PDB file of C-alpha atoms in Angstrom:
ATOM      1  CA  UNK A   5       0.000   0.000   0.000  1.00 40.96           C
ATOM      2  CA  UNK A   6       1.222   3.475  -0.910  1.00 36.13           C
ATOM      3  CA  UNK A   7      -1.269   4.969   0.781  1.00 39.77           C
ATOM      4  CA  UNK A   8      -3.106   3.702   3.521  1.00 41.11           C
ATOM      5  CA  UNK A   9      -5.556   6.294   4.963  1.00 39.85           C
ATOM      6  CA  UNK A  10      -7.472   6.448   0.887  1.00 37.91           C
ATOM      7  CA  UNK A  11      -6.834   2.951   1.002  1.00 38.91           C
ATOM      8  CA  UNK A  12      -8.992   3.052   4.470  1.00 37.74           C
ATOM      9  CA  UNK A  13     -11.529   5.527   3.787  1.00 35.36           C
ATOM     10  CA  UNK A  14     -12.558   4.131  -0.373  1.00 38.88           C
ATOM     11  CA  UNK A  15     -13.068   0.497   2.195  1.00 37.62           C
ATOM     12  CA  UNK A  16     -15.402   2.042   4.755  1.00 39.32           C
ATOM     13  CA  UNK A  17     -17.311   3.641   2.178  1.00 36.19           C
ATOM     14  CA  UNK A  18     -17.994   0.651   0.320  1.00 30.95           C
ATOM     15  CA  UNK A  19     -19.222  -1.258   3.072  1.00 28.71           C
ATOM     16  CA  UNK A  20     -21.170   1.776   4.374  1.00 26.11           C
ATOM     17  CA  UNK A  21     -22.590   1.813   0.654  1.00 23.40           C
ATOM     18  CA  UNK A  22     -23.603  -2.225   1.058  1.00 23.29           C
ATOM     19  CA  UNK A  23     -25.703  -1.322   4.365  1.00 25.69           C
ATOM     20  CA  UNK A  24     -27.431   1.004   2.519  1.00 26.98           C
ATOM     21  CA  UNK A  25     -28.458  -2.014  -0.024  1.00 27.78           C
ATOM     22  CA  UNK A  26     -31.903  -2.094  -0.269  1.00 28.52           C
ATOM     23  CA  UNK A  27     -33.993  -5.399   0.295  1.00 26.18           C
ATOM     24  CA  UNK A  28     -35.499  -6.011  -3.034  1.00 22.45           C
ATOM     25  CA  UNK A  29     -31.771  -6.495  -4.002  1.00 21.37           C
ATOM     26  CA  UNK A  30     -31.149  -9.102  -1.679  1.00 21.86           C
ATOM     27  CA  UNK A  31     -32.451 -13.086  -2.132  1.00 21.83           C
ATOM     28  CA  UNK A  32     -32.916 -15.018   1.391  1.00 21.44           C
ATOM     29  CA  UNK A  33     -30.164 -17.827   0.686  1.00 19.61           C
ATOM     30  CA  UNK A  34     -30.688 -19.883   4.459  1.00 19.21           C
ATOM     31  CA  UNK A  35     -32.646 -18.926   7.446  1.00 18.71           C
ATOM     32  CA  UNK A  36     -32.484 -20.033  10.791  1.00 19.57           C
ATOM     33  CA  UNK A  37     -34.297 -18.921  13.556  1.00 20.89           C
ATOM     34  CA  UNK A  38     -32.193 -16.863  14.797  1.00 19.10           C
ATOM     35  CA  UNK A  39     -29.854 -15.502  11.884  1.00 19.21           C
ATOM     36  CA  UNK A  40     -30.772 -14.947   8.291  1.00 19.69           C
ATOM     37  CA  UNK A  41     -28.164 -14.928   5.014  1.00 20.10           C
ATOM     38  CA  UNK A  42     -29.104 -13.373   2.172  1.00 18.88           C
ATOM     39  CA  UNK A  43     -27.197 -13.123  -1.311  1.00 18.22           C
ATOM     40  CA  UNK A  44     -26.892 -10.705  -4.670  1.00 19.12           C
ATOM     41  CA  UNK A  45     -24.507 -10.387  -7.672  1.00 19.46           C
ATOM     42  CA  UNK A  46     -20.965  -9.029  -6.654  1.00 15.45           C
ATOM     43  CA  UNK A  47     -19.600  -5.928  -8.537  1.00 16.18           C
ATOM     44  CA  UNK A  48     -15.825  -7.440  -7.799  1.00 18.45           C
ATOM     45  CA  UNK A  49     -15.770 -10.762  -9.408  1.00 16.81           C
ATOM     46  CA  UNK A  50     -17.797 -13.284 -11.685  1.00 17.22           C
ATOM     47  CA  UNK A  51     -19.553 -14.414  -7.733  1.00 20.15           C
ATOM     48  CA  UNK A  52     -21.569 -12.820  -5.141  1.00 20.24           C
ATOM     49  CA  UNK A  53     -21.658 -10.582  -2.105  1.00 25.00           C
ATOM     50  CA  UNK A  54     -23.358 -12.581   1.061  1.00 23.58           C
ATOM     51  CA  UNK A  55     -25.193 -10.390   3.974  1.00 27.78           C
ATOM     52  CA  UNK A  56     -26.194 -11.725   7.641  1.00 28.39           C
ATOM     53  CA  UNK A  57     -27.810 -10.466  10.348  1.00 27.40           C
ATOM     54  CA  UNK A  58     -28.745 -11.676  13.834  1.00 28.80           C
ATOM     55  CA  UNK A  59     -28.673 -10.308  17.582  1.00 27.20           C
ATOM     56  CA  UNK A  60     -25.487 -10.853  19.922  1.00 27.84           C
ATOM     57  CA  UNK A  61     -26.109 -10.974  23.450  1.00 28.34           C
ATOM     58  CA  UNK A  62     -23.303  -8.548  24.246  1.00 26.65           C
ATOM     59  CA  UNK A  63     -22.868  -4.607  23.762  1.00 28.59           C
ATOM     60  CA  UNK A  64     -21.289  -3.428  20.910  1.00 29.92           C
ATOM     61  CA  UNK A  65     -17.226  -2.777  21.804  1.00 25.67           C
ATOM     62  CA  UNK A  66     -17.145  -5.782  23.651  1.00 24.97           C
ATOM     63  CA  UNK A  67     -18.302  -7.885  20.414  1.00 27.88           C
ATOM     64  CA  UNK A  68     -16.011  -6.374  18.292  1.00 30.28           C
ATOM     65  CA  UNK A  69     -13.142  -6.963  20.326  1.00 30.27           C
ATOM     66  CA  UNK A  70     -14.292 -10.380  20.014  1.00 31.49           C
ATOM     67  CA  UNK A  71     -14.327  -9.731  15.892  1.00 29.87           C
ATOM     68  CA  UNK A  72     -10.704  -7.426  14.994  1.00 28.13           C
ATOM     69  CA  UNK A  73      -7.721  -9.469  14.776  1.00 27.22           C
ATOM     70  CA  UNK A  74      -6.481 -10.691  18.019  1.00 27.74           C
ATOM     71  CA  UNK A  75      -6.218 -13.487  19.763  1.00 26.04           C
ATOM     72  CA  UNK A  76      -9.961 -13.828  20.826  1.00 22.39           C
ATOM     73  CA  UNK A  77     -10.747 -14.458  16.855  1.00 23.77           C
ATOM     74  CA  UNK A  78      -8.691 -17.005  16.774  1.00 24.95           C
ATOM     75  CA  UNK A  79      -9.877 -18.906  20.101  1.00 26.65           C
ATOM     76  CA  UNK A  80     -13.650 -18.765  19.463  1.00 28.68           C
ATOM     77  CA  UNK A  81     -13.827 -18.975  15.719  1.00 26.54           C
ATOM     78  CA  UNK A  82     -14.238 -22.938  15.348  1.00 27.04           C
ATOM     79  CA  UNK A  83     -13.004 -22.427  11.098  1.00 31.61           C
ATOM     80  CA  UNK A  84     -10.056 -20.341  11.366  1.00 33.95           C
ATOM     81  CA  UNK A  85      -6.785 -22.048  12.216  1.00 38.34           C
ATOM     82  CA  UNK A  86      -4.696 -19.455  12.168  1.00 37.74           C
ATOM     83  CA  UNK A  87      -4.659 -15.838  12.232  1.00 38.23           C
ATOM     84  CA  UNK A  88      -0.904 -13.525  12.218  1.00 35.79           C
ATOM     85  CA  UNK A  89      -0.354 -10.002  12.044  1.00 37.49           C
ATOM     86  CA  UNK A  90       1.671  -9.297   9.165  1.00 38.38           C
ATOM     87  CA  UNK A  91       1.680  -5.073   9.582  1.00 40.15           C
ATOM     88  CA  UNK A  92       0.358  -2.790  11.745  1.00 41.41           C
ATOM     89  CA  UNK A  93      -0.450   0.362  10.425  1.00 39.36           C
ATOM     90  CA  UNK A  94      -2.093   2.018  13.522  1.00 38.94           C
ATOM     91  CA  UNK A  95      -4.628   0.674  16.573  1.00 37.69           C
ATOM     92  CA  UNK A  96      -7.192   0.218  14.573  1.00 39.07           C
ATOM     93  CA  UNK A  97      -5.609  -0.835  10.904  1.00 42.08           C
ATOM     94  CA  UNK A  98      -3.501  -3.330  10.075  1.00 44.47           C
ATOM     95  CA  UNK A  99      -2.459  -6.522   7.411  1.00 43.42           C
ATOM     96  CA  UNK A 100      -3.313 -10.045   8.776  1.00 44.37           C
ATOM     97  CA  UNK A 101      -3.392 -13.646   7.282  1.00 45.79           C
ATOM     98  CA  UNK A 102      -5.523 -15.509   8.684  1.00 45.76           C
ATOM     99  CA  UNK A 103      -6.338 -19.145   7.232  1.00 46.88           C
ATOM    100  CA  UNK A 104      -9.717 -21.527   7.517  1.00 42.52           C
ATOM    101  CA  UNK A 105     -10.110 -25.602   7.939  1.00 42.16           C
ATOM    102  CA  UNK A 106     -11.497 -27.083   4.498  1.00 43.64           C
ATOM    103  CA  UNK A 107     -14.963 -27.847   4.778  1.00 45.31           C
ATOM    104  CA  UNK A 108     -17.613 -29.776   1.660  1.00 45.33           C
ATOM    105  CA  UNK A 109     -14.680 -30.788   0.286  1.00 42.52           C
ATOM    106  CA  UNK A 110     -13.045 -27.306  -0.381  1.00 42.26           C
ATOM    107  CA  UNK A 111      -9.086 -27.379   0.445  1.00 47.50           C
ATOM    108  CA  UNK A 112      -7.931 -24.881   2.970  1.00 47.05           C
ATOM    109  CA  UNK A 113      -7.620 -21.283   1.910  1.00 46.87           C
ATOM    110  CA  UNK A 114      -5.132 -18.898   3.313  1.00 48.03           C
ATOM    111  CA  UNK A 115      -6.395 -14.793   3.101  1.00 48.73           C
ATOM    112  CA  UNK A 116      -4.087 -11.584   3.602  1.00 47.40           C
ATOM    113  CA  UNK A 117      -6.319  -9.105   3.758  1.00 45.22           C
ATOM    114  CA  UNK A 118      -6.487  -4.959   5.110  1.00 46.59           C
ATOM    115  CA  UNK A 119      -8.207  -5.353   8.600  1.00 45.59           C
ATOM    116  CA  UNK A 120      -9.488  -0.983   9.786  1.00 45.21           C
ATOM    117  CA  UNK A 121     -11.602  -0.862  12.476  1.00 44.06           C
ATOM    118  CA  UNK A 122     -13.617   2.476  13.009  1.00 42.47           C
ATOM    119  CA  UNK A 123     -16.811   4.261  14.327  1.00 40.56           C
ATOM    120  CA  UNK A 124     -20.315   3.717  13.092  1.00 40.71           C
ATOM    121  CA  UNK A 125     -22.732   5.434  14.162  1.00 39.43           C
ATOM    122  CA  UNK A 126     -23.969   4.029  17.502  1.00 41.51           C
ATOM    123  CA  UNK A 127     -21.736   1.399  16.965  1.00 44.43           C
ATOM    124  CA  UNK A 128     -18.536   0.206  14.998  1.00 45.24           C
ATOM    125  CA  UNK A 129     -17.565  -1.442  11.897  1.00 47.40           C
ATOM    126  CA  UNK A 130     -14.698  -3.367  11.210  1.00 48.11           C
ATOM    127  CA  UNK A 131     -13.799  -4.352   7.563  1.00 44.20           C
ATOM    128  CA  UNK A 132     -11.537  -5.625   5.053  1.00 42.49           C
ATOM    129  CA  UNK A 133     -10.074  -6.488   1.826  1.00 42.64           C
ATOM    130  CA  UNK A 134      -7.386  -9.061   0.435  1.00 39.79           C
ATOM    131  CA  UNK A 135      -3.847  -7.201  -0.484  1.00 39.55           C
ATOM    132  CA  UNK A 136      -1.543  -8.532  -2.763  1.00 43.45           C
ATOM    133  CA  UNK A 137       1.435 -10.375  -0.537  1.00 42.86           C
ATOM    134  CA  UNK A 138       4.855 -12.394  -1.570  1.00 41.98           C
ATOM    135  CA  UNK A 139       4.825 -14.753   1.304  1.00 39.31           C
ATOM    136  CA  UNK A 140       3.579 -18.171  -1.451  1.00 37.53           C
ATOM    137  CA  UNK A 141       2.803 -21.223   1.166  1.00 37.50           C
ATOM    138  CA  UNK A 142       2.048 -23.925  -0.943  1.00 36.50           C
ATOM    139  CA  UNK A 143      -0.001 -25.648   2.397  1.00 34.29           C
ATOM    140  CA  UNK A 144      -3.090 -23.072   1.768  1.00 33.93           C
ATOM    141  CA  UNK A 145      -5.024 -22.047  -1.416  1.00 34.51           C
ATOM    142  CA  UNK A 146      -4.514 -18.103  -1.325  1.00 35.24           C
ATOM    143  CA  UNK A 147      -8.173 -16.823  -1.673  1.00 36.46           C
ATOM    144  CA  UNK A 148      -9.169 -13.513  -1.830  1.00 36.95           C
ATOM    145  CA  UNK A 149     -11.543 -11.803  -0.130  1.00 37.05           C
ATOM    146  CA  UNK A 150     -13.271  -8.604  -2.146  1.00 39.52           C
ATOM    147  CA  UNK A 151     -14.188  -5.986   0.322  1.00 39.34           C
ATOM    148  CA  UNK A 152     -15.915  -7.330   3.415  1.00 41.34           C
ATOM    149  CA  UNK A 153     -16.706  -6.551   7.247  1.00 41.97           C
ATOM    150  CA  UNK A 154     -19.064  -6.370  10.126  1.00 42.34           C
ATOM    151  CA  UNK A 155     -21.196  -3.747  11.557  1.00 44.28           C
ATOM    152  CA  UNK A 156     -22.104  -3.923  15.243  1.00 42.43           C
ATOM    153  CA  UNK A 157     -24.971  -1.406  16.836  1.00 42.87           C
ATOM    154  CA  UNK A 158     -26.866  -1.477  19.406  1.00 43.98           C
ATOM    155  CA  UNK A 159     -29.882  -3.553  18.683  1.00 47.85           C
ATOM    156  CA  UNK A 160     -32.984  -0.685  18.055  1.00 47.85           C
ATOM    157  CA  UNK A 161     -35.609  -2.626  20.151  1.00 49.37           C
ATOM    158  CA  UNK A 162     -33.512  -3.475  22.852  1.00 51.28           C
ATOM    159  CA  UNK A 163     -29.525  -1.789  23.512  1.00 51.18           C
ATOM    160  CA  UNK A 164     -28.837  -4.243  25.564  1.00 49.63           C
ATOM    161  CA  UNK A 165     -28.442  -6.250  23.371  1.00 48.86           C
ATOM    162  CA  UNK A 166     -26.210  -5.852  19.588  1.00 47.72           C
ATOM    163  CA  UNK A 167     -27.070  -6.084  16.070  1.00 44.42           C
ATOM    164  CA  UNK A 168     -24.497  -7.666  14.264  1.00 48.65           C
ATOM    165  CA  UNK A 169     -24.536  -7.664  10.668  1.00 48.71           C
ATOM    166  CA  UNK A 170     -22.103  -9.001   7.862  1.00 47.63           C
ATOM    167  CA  UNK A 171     -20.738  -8.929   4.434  1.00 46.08           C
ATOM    168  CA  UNK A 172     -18.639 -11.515   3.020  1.00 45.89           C
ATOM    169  CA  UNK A 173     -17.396 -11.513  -0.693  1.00 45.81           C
ATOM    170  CA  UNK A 174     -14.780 -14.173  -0.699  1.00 45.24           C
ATOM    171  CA  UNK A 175     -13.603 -15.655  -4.226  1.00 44.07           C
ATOM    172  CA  UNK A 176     -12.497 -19.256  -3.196  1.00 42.34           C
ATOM    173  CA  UNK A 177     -10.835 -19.756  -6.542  1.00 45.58           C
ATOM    174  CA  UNK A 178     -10.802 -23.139  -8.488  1.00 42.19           C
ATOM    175  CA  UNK A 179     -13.476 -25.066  -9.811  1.00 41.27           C
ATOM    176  CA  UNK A 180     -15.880 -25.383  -7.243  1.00 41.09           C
ATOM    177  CA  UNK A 181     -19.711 -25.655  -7.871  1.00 39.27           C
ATOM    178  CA  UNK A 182     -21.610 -22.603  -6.733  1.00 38.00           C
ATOM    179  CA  UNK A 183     -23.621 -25.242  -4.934  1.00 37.83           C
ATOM    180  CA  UNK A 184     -20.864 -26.212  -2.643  1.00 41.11           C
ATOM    181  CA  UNK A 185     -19.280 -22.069  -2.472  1.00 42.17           C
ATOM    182  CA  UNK A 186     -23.364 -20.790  -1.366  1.00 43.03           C
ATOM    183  CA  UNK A 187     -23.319 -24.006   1.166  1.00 42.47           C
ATOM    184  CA  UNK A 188     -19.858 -23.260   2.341  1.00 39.68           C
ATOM    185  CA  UNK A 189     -20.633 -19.117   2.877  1.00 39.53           C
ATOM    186  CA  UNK A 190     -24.339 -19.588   4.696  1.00 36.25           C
ATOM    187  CA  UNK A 191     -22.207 -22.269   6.774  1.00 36.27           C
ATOM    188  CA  UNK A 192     -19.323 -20.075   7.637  1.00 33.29           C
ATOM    189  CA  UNK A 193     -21.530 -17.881   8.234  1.00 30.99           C
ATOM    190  CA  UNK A 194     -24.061 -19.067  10.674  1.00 35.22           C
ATOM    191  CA  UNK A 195     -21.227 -21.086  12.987  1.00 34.23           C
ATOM    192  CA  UNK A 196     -19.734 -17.925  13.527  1.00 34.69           C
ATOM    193  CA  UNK A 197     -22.768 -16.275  14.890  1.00 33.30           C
ATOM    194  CA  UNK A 198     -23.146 -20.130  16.847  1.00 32.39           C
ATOM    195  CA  UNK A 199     -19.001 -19.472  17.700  1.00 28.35           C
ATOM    196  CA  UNK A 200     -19.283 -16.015  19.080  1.00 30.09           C
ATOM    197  CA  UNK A 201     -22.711 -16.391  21.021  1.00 30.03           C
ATOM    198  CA  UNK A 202     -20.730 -19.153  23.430  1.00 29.69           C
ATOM    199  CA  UNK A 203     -17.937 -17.392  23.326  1.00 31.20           C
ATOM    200  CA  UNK A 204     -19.356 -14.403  25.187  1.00 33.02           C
TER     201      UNK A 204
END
């Protein structure tokens, strides 16, 4: 990066520009009863951006402590397997790797991605975006993840509780069915609302 504060602020935008998505451009891809993953065509690659939403029984800093890179991600997130810090930029902005277990038959990926963590309006969002990076391991499949993140406010019918809501746009690369990539994302997805409700 030659420039990491544009490189910040053009990534909060866009992901302040996805929460502003309206709903007839979403399509419910799984449900639960207690989190809810919709889909829509990605503007970054040939795939698709995935949005989820469900309540955290925790307040809003707490949770994303829980979230940033650190060593509580790591512990509670049942899919990742590792997670390093490869460059801090500031307290709230940084590079990190951070790799996942395979799962439906997909081999482990590896990501290096932007990590900024900022202010939202009652709450906080912390997002991110793969970065190119030399470091080739030949153990993990390097995916990439177009920009992503997680808001975190207070939930409107009841602070006490959080609304946590996220955007995933990960290309997976290889030839994978679509099938297997949508089952693999709503997965992903809904463990780590399962993960990070018994963490807390």
């Amino acid at each position: 990066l030659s420039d990491v504060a544009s490189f910040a602020t053009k990534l909060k935008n866009t992901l302040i520009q996805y929460h502003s998505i309206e709903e007839d451009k979403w399509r419910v891809a799984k449900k639960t009863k207690d989190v809810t993953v919709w889909r829509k065509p990605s503007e970054e690659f040939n795939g698709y951006l995935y949005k989820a939403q469900g309540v955290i029984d925790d307040l809003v800093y707490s949770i994303i402590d829980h979230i940033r890179p650190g060593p509580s991600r790591l512990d509670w997130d049942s899919l990742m397997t590792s997670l390093d810090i490869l460059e801090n930029f500031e307290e709230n902005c940084c590079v990190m790797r951070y790799t996942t277990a395979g799962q439906g038959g997909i081999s482990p990926r590896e990501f290096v991605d932007f990590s900024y963590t900022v202010g939202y309006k009652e709450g906080l969002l912390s997002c991110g975006i793969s970065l190119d990076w030399d470091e080739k391991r030949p153990e993990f499949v390097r995916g990439y993840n177009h920009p992503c993140g997680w808001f975190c406010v207070p939930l409107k019918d009841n602070p006490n509780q959080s609304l946590l809501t996220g955007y995933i746009q990960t290309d997976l690369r290889g030839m994978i069915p679509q099938s297997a990539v949508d089952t693999a994302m709503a997965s992903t997805l809904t463990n780590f609302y399962g993960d990070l409700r018994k963490a807390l």
